[PDB]
Design a protein around this ligand. Structure first.
Ligand SMILES: O=C(CO)[C@@H](O[C@H]1O[C@H](CO)[C@@H](O)[C@H](O)[C@H]1O)[C@H](O)[C@H](O)CO
Ligand SMILES: OC[C@H]1O[C@](O)(CO)[C@@H](O[C@H]2O[C@H](CO)[C@@H](O)[C@H](O)[C@H]2O)[C@@H]1O
Length: 632
């Protein structure tokens, strides 16, 4: 703007006004201030541009921003020197996320290890597995009873006391860092629980919390909005709103006890940015940006993926570039693939879940046909510089069939009919199916349904299907080798089956996702080194692929080129022009012809099986065989 308007230099002089002139002189000369000052200059114009694009000439914008930047300085000043070293290192190495060295795991602290002290005791296991990244499921205070598995947050600062204290969390994070492991946690920034102090105060009409949520007097606007809102948990409530005891209606995209925060209020942004800086200074390395798609609402639209949602995330990003450069964002957007990828950017979310690949791994097991998977790896895999996918096989959530109908239509596939088939297959309602999953949120108004169940349940391990172990290794091979940071759902690496206690526990019984949230299975973990057990076969074969990925630089980076196998059952792709991966999605042997392989060297070492493979004749793969062939 013109002479007189706000800019980094203006804002910095006002930050320093809290100091006596004597104190100020010292602050300005300090190392912390020089670093803060240079990052302000570099990144503040982005923060201002993004916020201006959202809030425009809102009276509260300048006061809120000065408040937030004063907080950003106090936060960076307090930030521990070991974390400032990580800041400098990541500032100098934006592609750390793209290294083949990275392998992630995720677990619930309570289910996997009891409590935070118990989790700290599991760290030698994480090292034995090879993890360099560990996502811990929501850790903070939440409603007793039903809390959407911790996702209805009653406090961003107080640890759930069943898990331990903030001090225990601090020690865990430092212990993870000592072991070479990044700490990853959720930033549940779209909504709080209805017991959160802000929600109570907002609903009670406390002016300090005016417009922190979206509360309406009656159904007039909810009915209007509901004309275009998708139902995420239709078993819980219709549309996007829930009714308070006093008769008013509040926006609740998810459960009725999760109230969507009102980002059209710039004081909400500032509030959440303060919570973000608190997590940063715990030493968190990556924040999982929960429900990114939903943070802006607009009548007559889906209220998903709106331009302002992307702008607010880029504003949050610039706050981290200024006050905690180590802290990266992981986008969790389970939406149309055209929209998934728009969250991924060095200035937005540097990494994002890849639900397209994950959904299509499962699809290809069901159909035995790699067509959709091949299409996605050909046209939707490669990303902008300085960004990466998080490739995964399962998560704490159901599987949604989030492939693009337009893509499927190019292949002669009707998306609607195909999902009906996938849904039947994976819940064991299709002749011959190996899968033992359970439905989640069947919606009779749309035909939509998703699938619950662990990786091992969905491949046939519960019934001892002789192909189950090999199916698990095949799916993980692809997440481990396509390019991106792979994420193991801990428990999968020993073949953990569903919890069949869940259906009868009245705090869980309306949420079939609890089927694939079992506790740590001591008996299976105890078999992990025994090659005659399914646990041992799964664990040693995953561990072997992790060792290869992490040691072999032909896996480095996020880029791939697909290779046409000329066999509809076999997927093929090349990393770094040097590693040729084939995966057979058929339960029968399948061949890649000598003719298809003419451009390849006569012989190549297979890193999976350890044998030299001849490529100048027909290559027959065993049912569900993976080969990782060194061609350069
Ligand atoms: O269910 C979800 C939507 O299909 C939400 O998922 C996220 O938040 C939910 C509420 O906090 C929580 O239920 C779920 O475990 C969490 O992963 C995700 O934000 C969504 O997948 C991304 O677009
Ligand atoms: O076109 C005949 C037959 O010959 C090749 O082009 C090899 O010379 C086969 O194509 C395969 O190999 C290519 C180079 O490695 C690769 O890019 C193709 O994806 C793959 O099918 C083709 O089948």
């Amino acid at each position: 703007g013109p002479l007189g308007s706000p800019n980094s230099q203006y804002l910095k002089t006002r930050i320093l006004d809290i100091y006596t002139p004597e104190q100020r002189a010292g602050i300005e000369k300090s190392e912390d201030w020089r670093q803060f000052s240079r990052r302000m200059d570099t990144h503040f114009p982005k923060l201002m541009n993004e916020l201006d694009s959202v809030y425009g000439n809102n009276e509260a914008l300048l006061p809120m921003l000065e408040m937030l930047l004063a907080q950003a300085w106090q936060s960076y000043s307090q930030r521990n020197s070991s974390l400032k070293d990580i800041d400098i290192a990541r500032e100098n190495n934006p592609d750390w996320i793209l290294s083949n060295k990275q392998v992630g795991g995720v677990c619930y602290v309570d289910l996997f290890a009891g409590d935070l002290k118990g989790l700290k005791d599991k760290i030698p296991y994480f090292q034995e597995l090879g993890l360099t990244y560990l996502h811990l499921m929501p850790l903070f205070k939440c409603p007793e009873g039903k809390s959407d598995g911790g996702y209805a947050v009653s406090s961003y600062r107080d640890v759930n006391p069943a898990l331990g204290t903030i001090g225990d969390l601090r020690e865990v994070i430092a212990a993870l860092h000592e072991a070479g492991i990044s700490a990853v946690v959720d930033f549940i920034f779209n909504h709080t629980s209805n017991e959160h102090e802000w929600a109570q105060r907002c609903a009670a009409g406390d002016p300090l919390f005016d417009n922190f949520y979206y509360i309406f007097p009656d159904r007039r606007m909810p009915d209007q909005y509901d004309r275009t809102l998708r139902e995420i948990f239709p078993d819980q409530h219709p549309g996007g709103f829930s009714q308070l005891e006093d008769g008013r209606w509040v926006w609740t995209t998810f459960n009725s006890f999760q109230w969507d925060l009102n980002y059209s209020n710039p004081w909400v942004f500032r509030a959440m940015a303060g919570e973000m800086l608190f997590l940063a200074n715990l030493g968190v390395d990556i924040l999982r940006m929960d429900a990114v798609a939903f943070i802006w609402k607009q009548m007559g639209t889906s209220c998903e993926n709106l331009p302002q949602a992307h702008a607010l995330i880029r504003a949050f990003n610039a706050v981290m570039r200024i006050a905690a450069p180590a802290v990266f964002f992981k986008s969790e957007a389970i939406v149309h693939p055209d929209q998934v990828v728009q969250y991924i950017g060095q200035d937005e979310c540097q990494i994002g879940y890849n639900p397209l690949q994950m959904a299509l791994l499962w699809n290809t097991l069901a159909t035995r046909e790699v067509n959709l998977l091949h299409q996605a790896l050909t046209y939707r895999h490669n990303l902008p510089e300085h960004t990466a996918w998080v490739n995964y096989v399962r998560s704490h959530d159901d599987i949604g069939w989030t492939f693009a109908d337009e893509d499927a239509a190019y292949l002669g596939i009707s998306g609607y009919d195909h999902r009906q088939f996938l849904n039947r297959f994976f819940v064991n309602r299709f002749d011959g199916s190996f899968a033992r999953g359970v439905p989640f949120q069947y919606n009779p108004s749309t035909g939509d349904c998703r699938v619950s169940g662990t990786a091992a349940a969905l491949v046939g391990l519960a019934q001892d299907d002789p192909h189950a172990v090999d199916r698990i290794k095949l799916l993980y091979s692809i997440a481990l080798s396509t390019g991106g940071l792979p994420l193991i759902y801990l428990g999968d690496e020993v073949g953990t089956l569903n919890d069949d206690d869940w259906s009868q526990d009245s705090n869980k019984s309306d949420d079939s996702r609890w089927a694939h949230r079992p506790r740590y299975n001591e008996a299976l973990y105890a078999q992990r080194n025994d090659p005659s057990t399914a646990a041992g076969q799964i664990y040693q074969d995953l561990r072997h692929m992790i060792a290869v990925r992490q040691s072999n630089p032909r896996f480095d980076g996020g880029r791939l080129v697909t290779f046409n196998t000329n066999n509809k059952h076999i997927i093929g792709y090349i990393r770094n022009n040097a590693l040729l991966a084939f995966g057979n999605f058929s339960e029968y042997p399948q061949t890649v012809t000598a003719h298809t392989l003419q451009a390849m060297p006569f012989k190549a070492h297979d890193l999976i099986g350890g044998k030299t493979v001849s490529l100048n004749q027909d290559l027959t793969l065993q049912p569900y065989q993976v080969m990782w062939l060194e061609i350069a």
